[PDB]
Amino acid sequence: KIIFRLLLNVLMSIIAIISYQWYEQLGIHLTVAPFSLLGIAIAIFLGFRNSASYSRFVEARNLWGTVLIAERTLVRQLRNILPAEHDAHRRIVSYLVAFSWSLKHQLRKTDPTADLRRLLPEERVTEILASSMPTNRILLLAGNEIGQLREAGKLSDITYGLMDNKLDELAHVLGGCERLATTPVPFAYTLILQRTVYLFCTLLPFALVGDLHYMTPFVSVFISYTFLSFDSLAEELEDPFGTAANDLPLNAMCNTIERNLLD
Amino acid sequence: KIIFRLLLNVLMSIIAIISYQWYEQLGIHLTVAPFSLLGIAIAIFLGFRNSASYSRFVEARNLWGTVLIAERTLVRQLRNILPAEHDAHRRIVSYLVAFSWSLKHQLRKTDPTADLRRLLPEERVTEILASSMPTNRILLLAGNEIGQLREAGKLSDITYGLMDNKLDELAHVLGGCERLATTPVPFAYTLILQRTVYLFCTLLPFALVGDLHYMTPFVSVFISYTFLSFDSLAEELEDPFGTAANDLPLNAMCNTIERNLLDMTGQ
Amino acid sequence: SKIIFRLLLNVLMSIIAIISYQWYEQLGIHLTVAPFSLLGIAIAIFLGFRNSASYSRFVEARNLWGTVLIAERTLVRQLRNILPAEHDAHRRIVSYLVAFSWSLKHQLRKTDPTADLRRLLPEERVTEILASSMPTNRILLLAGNEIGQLREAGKLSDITYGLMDNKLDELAHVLGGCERLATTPVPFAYTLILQRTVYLFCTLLPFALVGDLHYMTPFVSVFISYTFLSFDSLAEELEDPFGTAANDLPLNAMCNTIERNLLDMTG
Amino acid sequence: SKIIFRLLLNVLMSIIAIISYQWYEQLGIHLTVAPFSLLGIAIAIFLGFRNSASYSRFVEARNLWGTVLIAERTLVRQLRNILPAEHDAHRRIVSYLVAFSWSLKHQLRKTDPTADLRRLLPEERVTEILASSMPTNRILLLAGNEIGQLREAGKLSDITYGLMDNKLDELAHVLGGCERLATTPVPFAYTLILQRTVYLFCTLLPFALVGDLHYMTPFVSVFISYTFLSFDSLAEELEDPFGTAANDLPLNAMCNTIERNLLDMTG
Amino acid sequence: KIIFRLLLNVLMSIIAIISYQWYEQLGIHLTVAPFSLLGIAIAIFLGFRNSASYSRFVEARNLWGTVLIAERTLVRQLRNILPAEHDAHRRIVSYLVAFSWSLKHQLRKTDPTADLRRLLPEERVTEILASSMPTNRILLLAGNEIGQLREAGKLSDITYGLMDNKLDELAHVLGGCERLATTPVPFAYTLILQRTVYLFCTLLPFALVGDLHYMTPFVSVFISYTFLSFDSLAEELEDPFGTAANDLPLNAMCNTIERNLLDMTGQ
Ligand SMILES: [Zn+2]
Ligand SMILES: [Zn+2]
Ligand SMILES: [Zn+2]
Ligand SMILES: [Zn+2]
Ligand SMILES: [Zn+2]
Ligand SMILES: [Zn+2]
Ligand SMILES: [Zn+2]
Ligand SMILES: [Zn+2]
Ligand SMILES: [Zn+2]
Ligand SMILES: [Zn+2]
Ligand SMILES: [Zn+2]
Ligand SMILES: [Zn+2]
Ligand SMILES: [Zn+2]
């Protein structure tokens, strides 16, 4: 939407020239000095705000990376400690894949039923969907398979420990994503500063014109671009899970985990 | 609160314009340039102040998230290692929920006793309220449960250590919240700066009135809106265990924890 | 504070400015704002980036002592769950943990801790303690001797023994933390120099202002000087966390809360 | 770099502006310096932050590739401390580990690991690997299959096995991090579009300085541009950590450091 | 070597006060406004640059702080688990101390042999020196001793693992140091910025003179001092493993660790 507000700045500059030669006549003066004070303060505050939003996105991407790492080492460990229990392979792998897809749907407020019925039996799908947090459930189920191998005596308490620790990695991951999606940390102010920048960009012409005249737009559209390009970054980073093509590519990540774990 | 000052600002602007004629006579010249120096100063400073307030608030949110995580897996580990012992599932889950709520009440400066006794017997509720470190007592009893199950031979030293770790995670969380509230040690500056930023925003029109005259208010109010809105940003994040709106949703969190662990146990 | 001296000084110096704006073109001294805005913003940028590190390390000290409390709390919990029985062994442990705390506080305030071990430990260990170069390291080797005596007894398996030793690491690391921050001679490479730089800046500022401001010089000069000197004092505070000033950490109350925690936990 | 190209452009632009100041009041239109101070400072701030992102990316990449050397070093250590005379395993595991390293280099440059693979392994498993979704991951799996092969045969307990499996975790987490920086980079976007805004700001700049600077415009408008153009080129050198350039990370050199190390550890 | 720059700067002020004349010629004027843009820009760039440099320095510090902690508690564990096996202790302590020296000698590219023979048996020194990576070779040899305690039954897999994990705090340290020592990162932007600050300063009076007249050699040396201080701050942090006086002492660090490791073995 930057080119709209840009080429609306062009308008407000034309207005600030065809309405410039009237200022003392009816009052009003305007100087660059306040607007570069304001401008520098806005440039400092944007940098700090973006630094937060960038942080959020970076943290989200790290959480989803740990999904992939943990779910890979758990299947590796099954294949290496119980090399010969493949009917447990499938059960665990499918609970893991279930869990990935199920998290994606959690973050998107979408229906996971569809995806669950492809990987798991309906007797599981209903138990899963019934929970106040189906992801946590799918983890509980993974833990079940892992501990039944223990009571079966196929896993020592040591090796049970090794693998259980990955359900721990996966839980620390679920809690993370809930933290970022459930609790936005003061993102309302992102609206505020947005407003602020726009207001700034549409006044700058009326202040620049005294020094720039017919050059007023050429300068006042450069400056605003540099400011509108910076605020825009906060808009494309602050929703790491959302529908927008820039947000984290969760469908594609999930496909990656499922393809990995299949073996 | 902010809009009180955004109006007071226009008071200072019209007061400046009416106050302008006696400037030359009375011997007062005021120029924007020092005030740009001051404004750019204050702005930098707020950026760093704010930067810190934000980090504190993130630590509190991350620390609470750790509760939800650690308890979820502690329960899970019970139901996976000792799936046929729900007499301990009940007691451990009830200690864990009581840990969360005890904490929430610690940080809110309120009586933790109601939620405490709703989920426990009286015989231990006493020993907890009768401690000066109640939330730490709850962890003592919750560990005592696992130690029991180990003496009983129902947990090996391996599988006991597994749950003991997650207790250690909760202990770190408790130390964390304790430190974060554990005084705002001489951070008086967040006050100082605020007091600064108000003064600035009120003196600003008396500097701007020469170079702007009848334009002065709108500009000043604009700047006072910009400096104030950012400044008040580090009032919110600075108290994170509060009764405020943008503050942490602790009550909702503990509710989520209870429903989580009750639902995991089958209740 | 020490700044409310500096504020009065600034007012004095701007008076000097107004009474000595006359000998200006004569002595050849022209002083304008615009070079001093460069100096001021350069300085503010630098203060932000300096305070940034100062708050970082003060925060680190905070987190280190909090970690002391957590680790010892849990080592006590672990004993009260794996060896519910041997309460007489524990006091010799809790006595070493409290000995460790106070020996840290005296290790940092650089004082003589002998009058404090005698309250916690028999005197045969005390001369052994003072004998070694670093007595906190020694108290740790001793509490380790306790846990490890319980190991050789058979009262602890290598698993449970491990569980406990790890917390003597959660503790050794805090030791080596406070050390690295103490022997860290406070990186005043820029800090004393920044404080100086800001002082000089603040006393000059009126001379660069008076040409443009006249009688209004002292007012604007002290607002600016305050804003800079207040953000600067923020470092005099957050740089001696192991000191005694009202800003520096309360290490005595902190050791004491450690003690009443451990005592309260040992019945 | 080809930066002295845009410096050249600024000299030439200064000559145009120097012999265009006459024409300038064509419509009484001027270009002051004040607004380009606004724009220049703002750009500088934004370069600070953006670069900060770029740098962080680079440093992390460097860290993960260091961890590779670290974890393989320990895993071979434990293979020599615990099974000090297995030898068959001593070579087989090291070949799988070198092959992991080289194959990670290939993975990030999207290049052909068949050649190094064949160099280190029998094609009996070169094919098991090349036919996998993520050959790096199949290689970690094969290493595991050797450590489990040794546990099965009882030559490692579940405890020593666990020790080594922690290190194959250390390696999995490395792979994951690199794969994230490459497959899921945070919005690259703004970087390139700053290089635009910076460039333009350089060329447009002397048209504003000439009015103040006369026949000094070339020598100064260049200095300024250099400053900006230098800081900005940081992003380029620090955003392709895995790519091919002098200024990039010498992954080949690193993989030969790793191989030389592990072959040193096995005589 | 900074005061060289300050004196030279005073000189060029004087030059500015006289050659200001011939600036009427053609048009070679220098304003304050362009240098205030450039100075503010340079202040920002310096800020972010020092930020990175500081971080690299702290990381070096803490790496070493972990040499201290890790070796300390490996010794204590050896005592509380194997208190009777002094003949082992003296060996493993020899290898830990030798690791510290060989690490420092590595980061200084100085020769280690003098310390190695002082601490280790000729036939081990020959091997360590024969390696291409002797610090790692030392960690390995420290391994064979612990792993032979395990091979003798004097250590169980649990306790062995509790020590093995310290050989890892160490391995992680040696890697971190090596990576910190293969820098420069961009290949030396921080040099480029240094020159940029030198030029900015030793052109600044030519731009101040038109306004400050004699007050030029004063305001100017103040400004140059501010920038040159903040920037000289980096050349100190960038080489933390260096011979120069601002860098970590290391030899002091290596001594502190040696005496710490002897005052824990009754030596
Ligand atoms: Zn399979
Ligand atoms: Zn249950
Ligand atoms: Zn019953
Ligand atoms: Zn009550
Ligand atoms: Zn955990
Ligand atoms: Zn702990
Ligand atoms: Zn340690
Ligand atoms: Zn007790
Ligand atoms: Zn071998
Ligand atoms: Zn892991
Ligand atoms: Zn001119
Ligand atoms: Zn000994
Ligand atoms: Zn390791």
Numbering used by the authors:
A (entry chain B): 23 to 285
B (entry chain D), E (entry chain E): 23 to 289
C (entry chain C), D (entry chain A): 22 to 288
Paper text:
The Y236A, Y236C, and W287F mutants all conducted Ca2+-dependent Cl− currents significantly bigger than those from WT hBest1 under the same conditions, indicating gain-of-function phenotypes. Moreover, the Y236C and W287F mutants retained the CH3SO3− to Cl− relative permeability but not the trans-promotive effect of CH3SO3−, functionally resembling hBest1 3A, rather than hBest1 I205A. As the cBest1 3A mutant structure shows a constantly unconstrained neck, the gain-of-function in Y236A, Y236C, and W287F is likely a result of enhanced open probability of the neck. Consistent with the functional results, no structural change was found at the aperture. Although the structure at the neck region was surprisingly unaltered, possibly due to the molecular packing effect in the crystal or the presence of Zn2+ in the crystallization solution which might stabilize the channel in a closed state, all three KpBest mutants displayed conformational changes on P208, Y211, and W252 (equivalent to P233, Y236, and W287 in hBest1, respectively), reaffirming the mutual influence between these three residues. Therefore, W287 is an extremely sensitive “switch” of the neck.
Although the structure of hBest1 is still unsolved, two Best1 homolog structures, one from bacteria Klebsiella pneumoniae (KpBest) and the other from chicken (cBest1), have been previously reported. Overall, the channel is a pentameric assembly with a single ion-conducting pathway, which varies in diameter along its length and is constrained at two narrow points: a “neck” contributed by three residues (I62/I66/F70 in KpBest and I76/F80/F84 in hBest1/cBest1) on a transmembrane helix, and an “aperture” formed by a single residue (I180 in KpBest1, I205 in hBest1, and V205 in cBest1) on a cytosolic helix. Here, by electrophysiological and structural analyses, we show that the neck and aperture in hBest1 are both indispensable Ca2+-dependent gates, and their dysregulated opening by rationally designed or patient-derived mutations causes Ca2+-independent leak and elevates Ca2+-dependent channel activity.
